[PDB]
Amino acid sequence: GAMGNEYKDNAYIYIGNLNRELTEGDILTVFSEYGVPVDVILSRDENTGESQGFAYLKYEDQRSTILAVDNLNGFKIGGRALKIDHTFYRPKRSLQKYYEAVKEELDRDIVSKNNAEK
């Protein structure tokens, strides 16, 4: 059984301290420039959901990684210059609802499956 565990798909970019006024919607809006809708993780308090200021975006594409990292590195959002670093993290299923809620918005695109019918 091979799922491609040697292939780091759980790779993503790390965004640094953002404005507390910035929400996941704003974050997705910024990445909408590249038109690549994939996983997005915003560090929010487990009780009140306070924006901790750390953002992550997991998209699968080696070309787009280096592109977005260099392109967004130094880009200002609300006065906050985006510092993009490389990092990898495996989403635990104990928090699947979070990532699922993310794909809930992406489902509008995910509906289009590969291979058109028979």
């Binding site: 006024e21 929400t23 929010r44 308090d45 487990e46 009780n47 609300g78 928090l95």
Partner: peptide
């Protein structure tokens, strides 16, 4: 801490518009 021991976080896609004033 009865209401501080729960863990529930639901992504909220809202538009602040903070970046609108510079884009």
């Amino acid at each position: 801490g009865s209401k501080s021991q729960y863990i529930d976080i639901m992504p909220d896609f809202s538009p602040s518009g903070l970046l609108e004033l510079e884009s």
